[PDB]
Design a protein around this ligand. Sequence first.
Ligand SMILES: COc1ccc2c(Oc3cnc(CC(=O)Nc4cc(C)cc(CN(C)C)c4)c(OC)c3)ccnc2c1
Length: 305
Amino acid sequence: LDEHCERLPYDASKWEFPRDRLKLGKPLGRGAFGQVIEADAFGIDKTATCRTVAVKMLKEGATHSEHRALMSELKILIHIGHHLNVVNLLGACTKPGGPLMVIVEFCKFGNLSTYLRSKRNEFVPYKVAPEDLYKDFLTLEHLICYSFQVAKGMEFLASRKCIHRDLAARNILLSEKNVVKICDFGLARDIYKDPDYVRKGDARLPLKWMAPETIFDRVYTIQSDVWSFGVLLWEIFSLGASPYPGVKIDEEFCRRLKEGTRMRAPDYTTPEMYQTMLDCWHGEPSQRPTFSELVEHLGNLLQAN
Ligand SMILES: COc1ccc2c(Oc3cnc(CC(=O)Nc4cc(C)cc(CN(C)C)c4)c(OC)c3)ccnc2c1
């Protein structure tokens, strides 16, 4: 349903937030044409309550085309609606005289790739030592829990007839109480400057996260997002490492992948989590697990761990 966004509704009476009730702060993420800014919103979700929020908007260099793209993103966020594991839309500023602003809840710890890399040294598979009890360490349970939550969020997106197209740990945010939310920086990331995006024709694409059918056939489905989810699992259980370490991402990488070449197990995986990565990476899209099956499986692993 996310291919024809322009026909989706924008109910101003529900979503419109006055620009003067927003106290704009520091940048959280900046692209070439878009940006994400921290802000204090007055009474956006609870009467007369200040709330820290994240605001997506355009910047110098953007054109009317990026403005139309941002409005489509607002419409799809409305269609998607709320779930614990998706960043929740809180409001928007669309009235003339100011920039189009898309306001979502704030996720204090930022993107999951940077977070896990920063916390790599503070990881223990199992907190079992009596002295280690009051140490805020990441454990296997936390990693499986983040994995399970992203699958729940993706299952939810799928139920809304939407697909992600850029699922990766950089598009996962961490909030308080170990809650992770799916986001999509999009224009608020500078893909022409970001090494995760590689020139493949006239577009800069996240090649290391793409299914062979996306690279070779330009096919995007929920099952290609499952492939991306497998790559995300590898990022989680490598504690924020970059995929395919030491591999030049060229025509040869793409052919080897298309032929069945896969990544080796990351350093912090359990045998079952690596098997789950291999299952998401099945060459045949229909043979990959679905998000509903991944939710059930990860929920089982979380209960077994
Ligand atoms: C502390 O540092 C930080 C740093 C960054 C933060 C943050 O960044 C944002 C990231 N992305 C967006 C846009 C977005 O998520 N759009 C979107 C969401 C879904 C579920 C689906 C689709 C549709 N597509 C096709 C899949 C689009 C933001 O909008 C305001 C903010 C949010 C909160 N807190 C943040 C804290």
